[PDB]
Design a binder for these strands. Sequence first.
RNA 1: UGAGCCUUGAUGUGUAGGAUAGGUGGGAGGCUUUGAAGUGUGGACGCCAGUCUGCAUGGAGCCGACCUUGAAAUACCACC
RNA 2: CUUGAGUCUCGUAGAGGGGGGUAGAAUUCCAGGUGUAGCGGUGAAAUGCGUAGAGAUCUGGAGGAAUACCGGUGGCGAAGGCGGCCCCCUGGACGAAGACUGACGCUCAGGUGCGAAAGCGUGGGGAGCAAACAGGAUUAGAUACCCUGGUAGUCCACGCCGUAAACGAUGUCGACUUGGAGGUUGUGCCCUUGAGGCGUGGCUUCCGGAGCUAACGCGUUAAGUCGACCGCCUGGGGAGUACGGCCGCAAGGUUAAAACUCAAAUGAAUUGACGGGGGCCCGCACAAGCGGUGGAGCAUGUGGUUUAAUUCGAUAACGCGA
RNA 3: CGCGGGGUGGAGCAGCCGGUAGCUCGUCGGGCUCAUAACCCGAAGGUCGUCGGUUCAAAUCCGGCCCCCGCAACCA
RNA 4: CGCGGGGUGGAGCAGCCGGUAGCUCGUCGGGCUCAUAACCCGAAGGUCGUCGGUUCAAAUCCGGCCCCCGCAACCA
Lengths: 117, 70, 151
Amino acid sequence: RKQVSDGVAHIHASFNNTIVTITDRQGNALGWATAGGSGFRGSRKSTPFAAQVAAERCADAVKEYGIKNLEVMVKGPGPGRESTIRALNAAGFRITNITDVTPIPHNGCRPPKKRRV
Amino acid sequence: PVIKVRENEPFDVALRRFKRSCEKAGVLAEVRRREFYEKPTTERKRAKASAVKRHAKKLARENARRTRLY
Amino acid sequence: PRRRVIGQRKILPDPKFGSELLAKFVNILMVDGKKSTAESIVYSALETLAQRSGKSELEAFEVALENVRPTVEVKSRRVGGSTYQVPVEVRPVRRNALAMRWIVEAARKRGDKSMALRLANELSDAAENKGTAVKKREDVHRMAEANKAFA
RNA sequence: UGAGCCUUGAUGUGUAGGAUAGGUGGGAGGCUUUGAAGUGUGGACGCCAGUCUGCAUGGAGCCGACCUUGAAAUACCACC
RNA sequence: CUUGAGUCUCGUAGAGGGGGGUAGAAUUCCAGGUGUAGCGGUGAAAUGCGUAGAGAUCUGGAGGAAUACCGGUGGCGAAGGCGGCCCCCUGGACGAAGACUGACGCUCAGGUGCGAAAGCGUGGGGAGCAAACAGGAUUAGAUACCCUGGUAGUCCACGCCGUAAACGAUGUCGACUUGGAGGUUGUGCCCUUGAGGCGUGGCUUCCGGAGCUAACGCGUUAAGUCGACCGCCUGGGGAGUACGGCCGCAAGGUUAAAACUCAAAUGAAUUGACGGGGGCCCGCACAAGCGGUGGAGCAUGUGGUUUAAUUCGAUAACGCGA
RNA sequence: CGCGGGGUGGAGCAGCCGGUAGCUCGUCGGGCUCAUAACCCGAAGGUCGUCGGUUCAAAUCCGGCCCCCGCAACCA
RNA sequence: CGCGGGGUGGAGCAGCCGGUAGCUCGUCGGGCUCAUAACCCGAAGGUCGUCGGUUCAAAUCCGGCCCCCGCAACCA
């Protein structure tokens, strides 16, 4: 595999599960990991800790690519948002940019109905 | 909330800054709001109710303040 | 309780070695307020243990204790629909107690004949890092690890 | 992109162990100015101990039955 | 005659209406790249989608619907309602001065029109959402709430429907009666010496006086003090139902009884009690621990059954009166 | 009369080779429960309609009989 | 009869060189749990159908037999 110095970390942070995907700067995904994949289910995988460990796993996976610089793109609302980036930092990439990329419509599609609980 | 880490800037500081930016944006809040459909009526009601509450806080409480507690 | 925290009561150190911890252990062991018998048993356990491992009577005991002390235990919050066991850092006073209690339990369980002998055996096991108390400790730790997501 | 083949190279951890022993027969010394041991490392394999090999440097020696072992040297060798 | 009512002049603010363009974000799908085992979902799960390569991620395309921020107890409209930006057609409101008309006004049974959402008809459209429906949960059951899907419908055109807690639960028009704090939109003067100072008009939010009110409350935007016109009520149920008429493609709307039946039904406020309302606090209430009961045998009391009688009582009763 | 389903624990639905002998509601038992329809634990109820035989496994494969079904055909 | 797959822990799917001897659900113990399941930890169950041999590694490569598959061909 071709080594690459700089890339992006996409952090899809949902309410139920965090997904971290490291990619090159062009768009092509190198590796990924998830809180659900990291051995957490239901209550556990919707937590900051879980997200962090997913991030760590992802980092581990893209060791062979030899990535030093990293820009982070954080998507969605969740626990795995601050935690994940911290984890990434710990894992030892130079974090270059921290971007928020939550899809906010400018009033477009009707959301689903409100839950009655 | 696009941000770039400055030269010889700590990670933690950067993170904090990012968080602040996010807060300013009100992105999370927006997301929360758009999770489910709010009927127009409901939306109206909240807005008016909230306004009323605010008004109550401002004036009635001020009146109370004039008189000492003990 | 709700209203007021209270200062822990005064405990006398045991006559043989002059130790608070030892005294506490003896107390824990004791049943039906027969302290003397319990203390004798404890002493016996110590002596045998000392013979086995060398060192001193007290030092060996301490070492044994060390291998069964829990860094972290869990508690049940249960805020959700289902129960969530949450880990908590267990304080110095409590940890020591817990280990002792576990040891005692192990001793009680054990299939050897005399109580003192059983206790000694348990201590030895603890020192070596096998046995019942140690297992219990591991389990406790394991649970905490499992539920580390909650904090 | 799959896949054969004349050919010349590499590849092979039961534990005894100089340590990454496939087996049979002919055998006691093969290689060394169409350049030997030691050093620098480019690319491969890997059971992390090492093994083969490119180019540079070096210029007069490394490896044998060995002590062990159910089987002995990749001292040269042909058959696969 | 000019004070009401209207016309003309110049401005002003506006999601007022109709028509036609366009912009950007986001969702969905399609095609392709990267990539590898999960994704999704919940209180927890499962159905569901995934190694036939999903989810994630990037590129390109399609199409529909709605318009983040601005945005406000802000604005406009008779009400219903109206929200990206641009243009075309178009209705009303307000102010400034003048000039004109000269009571031309107010209200309105029948009548006529406009009238959310759903619904209907014909023809288009269809991304998202979603009655119905299906499956998965939950449950005693769950024809629900939750989850995964999902069709009418929502969108457009032209017709119909004519109702909503269509509410300020407050008809319209006019006059008069103490105050304060704002918002919005004009406009006159003033050294705008500055975001200001002093007025004067329109619409508007809150508080409160007199008065009014069953009280709650209303209070110059009246539910006060009066006048003009209209609409409507006459105990609760039966019933806004039946019959008949009129209207409607239908759904149904509208008009609108009676028998029979009860002595109530209601409104506001009051004291409690209660709440799977909220705040503060306590108790071996939980938590933290130690020892029990529930199994055994016996003692003992009770229930029951039996008995000639198994004395009567207790049932925070049951080693209780004893 | 002939031909396809088969015959059970208070009723019902029981895993192609005969060795598995049930599950639902029900009744009792006891605490939960402010109250139960509860959740949960355990307990009494058979013949496998019947008469026989192939075989140690038989109700469980076959010969006949009694019924319940279903059949479709008939009727001077 | 001839020819391609191979034959296992209660069932199933097990990493080209023979030295690795499993994973899922299952049963039991415990941990947590209101519950149940999910979840965590650990524990009993082999022959590798079989008979042999190349070799210290063999079920793990080969010679035969018993079956399960699959084959496609045949039948006076």
